[PDB]
Amino acid sequence: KHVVVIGAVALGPKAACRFKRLDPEAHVTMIDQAVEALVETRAHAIDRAAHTVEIENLRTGERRTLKYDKLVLALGSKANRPPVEGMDLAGVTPVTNLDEAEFVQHAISAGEVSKAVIVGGGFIGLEMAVSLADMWGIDTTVVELADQIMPGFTSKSLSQMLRHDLEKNDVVVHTGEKVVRLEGENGKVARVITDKRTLDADLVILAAGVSPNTQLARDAGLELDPRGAIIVDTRMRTSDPDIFAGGDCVTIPNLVTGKPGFFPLGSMANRQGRVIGTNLADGDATFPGAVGSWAVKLFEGSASGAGLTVEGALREGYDAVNVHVEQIMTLQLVVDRPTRRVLGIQGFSTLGDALTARINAVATMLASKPTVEDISNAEVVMDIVNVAGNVADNVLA
Amino acid sequence: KHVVVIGAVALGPKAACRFKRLDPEAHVTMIDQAVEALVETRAHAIDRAAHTVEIENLRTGERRTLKYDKLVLALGSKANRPPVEGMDLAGVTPVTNLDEAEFVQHAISAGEVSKAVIVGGGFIGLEMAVSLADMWGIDTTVVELADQIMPGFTSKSLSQMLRHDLEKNDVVVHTGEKVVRLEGENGKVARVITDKRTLDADLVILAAGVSPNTQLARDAGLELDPRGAIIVDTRMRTSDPDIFAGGDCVTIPNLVTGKPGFFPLGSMANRQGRVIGTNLADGDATFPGAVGSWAVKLFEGSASGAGLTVEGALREGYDAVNVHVEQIMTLQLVVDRPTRRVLGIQGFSTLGDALTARINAVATMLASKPTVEDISNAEVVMDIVNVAGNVADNVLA
Ligand SMILES: [Ca+2]
Ligand SMILES: [Ca+2]
Numbered sequence A, B: 001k002h003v004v005v006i007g008a009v010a011l012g013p014k015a016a017c018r019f020k021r022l023d024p025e026a027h028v029t030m031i032d033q034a035v036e037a038l039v040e041t042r043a044h045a046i047d048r049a050a051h052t053v054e055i056e057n058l059r060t061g062e063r064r065t066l067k068y069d070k071l072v073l074a075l076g077s078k079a080n081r082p083p084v085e086g087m088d089l090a091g092v093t094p095v096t097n098l099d100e101a102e103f104v105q106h107a108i109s110a111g112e113v114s115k116a117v118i119v120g121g122g123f124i125g126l127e128m129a130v131s132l133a134d135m136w137g138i139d140t141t142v143v144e145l146a147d148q149i150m151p152g153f154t155s156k157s158l159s160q161m162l163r164h165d166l167e168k169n170d171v172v173v174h175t176g177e178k179v180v181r182l183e184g185e186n187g188k189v190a191r192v193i194t195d196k197r198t199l200d201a202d203l204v205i206l207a208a209g210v211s212p213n214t215q216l217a218r219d220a221g222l223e224l225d226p227r228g229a230i231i232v233d234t235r236m237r238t239s240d241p242d243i244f245a246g247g248d249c250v251t252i253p254n255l256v257t258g259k260p261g262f263f264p265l266g267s268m269a270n271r272q273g274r275v276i277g278t279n280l281a282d283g284d285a286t287f288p289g290a291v292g293s294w295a296v297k298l299f300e301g302s303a304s305g306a307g308l309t310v311e312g313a314l315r316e317g318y319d320a321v322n323v324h325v326e327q328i329m330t331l332q333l334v335v336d337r338p339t340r341r342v343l344g345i346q347g348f349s350t351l352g353d354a355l356t357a358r359i360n361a362v363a364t365m366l367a368s369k370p371t372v373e374d375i376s377n378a379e380v381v382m383d384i385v386n387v388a389g390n391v392a393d394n395v396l397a
Helices: A011-022 A098-107 A123-136 A156-168 A215-220 A268-280 A310-315 A352-366 A372-376 A384-396 B011-022 B098-107 B123-136 B156-168 B215-220 B268-280 B310-315 B352-366 B372-376 B384-396
Strands: A002-006 A027-031 A036-038 A041-047 A052-057 A063-067 A070-073 A077-079 A092-094 A115-119 A139-143 A172-174 A179-184 A189-194 A198-200 A203-206 A210-212 A243-245 A250-253 A294-297 A302-307 A320-326 A329-336 A342-349 B002-006 B027-031 B036-038 B041-047 B052-057 B063-067 B070-073 B077-079 B092-094 B115-119 B139-143 B172-174 B179-184 B189-194 B198-200 B203-206 B210-212 B243-245 B250-253 B294-297 B302-307 B320-326 B329-336 B342-349
Touching: A002 A011, A002 A063, A011 A027, A011 A070, A011 A268, A027 A041, A041 A215, A070 A268, A098 A123, A115 A123, A115 A198, A123 A139, A123 A156, A123 A203, A123 A294, A156 A172, A156 A302, A156 A329, A156 A342, A189 A203, A243 A268, A268 B384, A294 A352, A302 A352, A310 A320, A310 A329, A310 A342, A320 A384, A329 A352, A329 A384, A342 A352, A342 A372, A352 A372, A352 A384, A352 B352, A372 A384, A384 B268, B002 B011, B002 B063, B011 B027, B011 B070, B011 B268, B027 B041, B041 B215, B070 B268, B098 B123, B115 B123, B115 B198, B123 B139, B123 B156, B123 B203, B123 B294, B156 B172, B156 B302, B156 B329, B156 B342, B189 B203, B243 B268, B294 B352, B302 B352, B310 B320, B310 B329, B310 B342, B320 B384, B329 B352, B329 B384, B342 B352, B342 B372, B352 B372, B352 B384, B372 B384
Parallel strands: A002 A027, A002 A070, A027 A036, A070 A243, A092 A203, A115 A139, A115 A203, A139 A172, B002 B027, B002 B070, B027 B036, B070 B243, B092 B203, B115 B139, B115 B203, B139 B172
Antiparallel strands: A041 A052, A052 A063, A077 A210, A179 A189, A189 A198, A294 A302, A302 A342, A320 A329, A329 A342, B041 B052, B052 B063, B077 B210, B179 B189, B189 B198, B294 B302, B302 B342, B320 B329, B329 B342
């Protein structure tokens, strides 16, 4: 077997290394899409019938046609960019994943950046806010279009706890605020203009969500969803059975809603890569989908969760209720009224590991469709998780 | 409704308080079996056809016949006592539950006890070892018949980690060692004689396991298992539909083995009590059984787990394998070879909450019969739990 892997994320290297452990006699070529590893190299087209990928080295222009028995698409995502003026200036930096986040953080050094504006108050935005202010003492402002930070990850009520953690450690936060244009001085960003103010920024981080980087799949004829996400089965196979895909370029079943979802989360990479590795070696490993577990560490508190927030469940049209419990630790449990199904759980605490233990207990249950009674009876090592289930059974009665 | 509750554990008060919240117009009488609360009072007999309990106040001898619509049996357990000489001396103290443990700990004061011997190195024994040595500086020795401490809760290999925590904080531990007799001075214990040595003890803690305290159920004609545990359905009803039972006097399904089990654990009380409360109020709440989640905090480390240990799984006749992973944190994962089912998980760490988070993730999964792939893919907030699943899939291949 020759296997070609396009993209170096976490997912590509993982799939290939797992592949090789199982089939050491096979050959793998990895292309970085900027173990035979071709850097600064782009796949230009995929010919599925012929099992060929045309590639081009971007420096020398030398073009080559690789042949494959199996292909892996680890194409990642691209930053959503507001259709506004100045989104082309130097200093405007997309960050679509945690690896990219770490790169930007370690490419900065003392005295380089004076003002940072983060566009987007999601997982990426908030982690960057904290890193820039804490590692480097950079003056940092988060600007979020939605009326809350972490929209879709925590409720509005819970988000305020996270908001305070940021504001009390000198991160300014603006919500319900739209970016109107970026203004520049050397062809380098110098100001962000919102619909409410003007902010000075010599660094602007784009962390406002992502789209699958799937033009190559599209051109090849692969089945894609309306969002452009590559559609895969549970073996991580695309509509072409010799082509696998994973990571932030695919859609997989949301295990709470039973509908197709999109999970561009770090954690998915390694797990899906392993399955792709095994299946490239003729195995039949499966990855069922996701419920969306997450954690963010802030200055003093930590926030964590899985599944739907109340607003998220309401947006899907569940008759949902948000039940909260406090101990500092807060849990919020999201429950469907008519079925009594638990749809999600989120929390905030100054004790990171203690909260994680509570969220994990429930997160691994969500795919099995637990009800409030399952949370009342959850056999956790009374505990706040059980108390949340009792309060929810009480709220529903 | 009049409901009579026999026993004040956690379970009795919980059942009654939940009952009352739902049906405030009803009456409850609670008997302590040494809200109308009769202390120093014993139930002598139950007449099921007549729905009556004859009781006797143990001080005055006054006898009374209570009538009931529903009865709750919270009879607890009794310490297993070796059929050896001197098990009647003052200073020989059975401890069958964590509440009893806390009682003994707070009844001692500075300079009262010089030497403590703990007979049994299980959950109770070890917690008492630690409390006595740490709160009070008592010279403490654990004597265990099995070749390891925590038999049935951790593997032999993992138990050594817990053993060391004890020995390095001055608790002496003897395993593979049998109690032959207790020797006394004032009709008070002064020495424990084992088959290997003589130990001075002015306090001897019996923590060598328990039997259900069910004579009253037996006399009443209630269906009991070979061990004497009251058999209940998932609504916590005995063979008499007007009589409920829970706590350490019942058997419920082991959710890993699919067979009847016995779970005299603190945690079960509150959860089962709530269900009994609701069902006394004409609800139809259920409690499915247990997998046996547990945690013990020692001097510096913590140990935690759920389900079967490898030796436990082997004793049940599973072709089981124990897979370990280290990071200090150790996890051990117990796997059935032919089905790939995970049967259990245990661990040890100096980080208490961090381990708990890992054990919880898997503990709430055990009843759903996860396989190694479910652990490889567990959607925990790569993580050591996933790594354990990958190593186990590797060991099995
Ligand atoms: Ca200018
Ligand atoms: Ca003598």
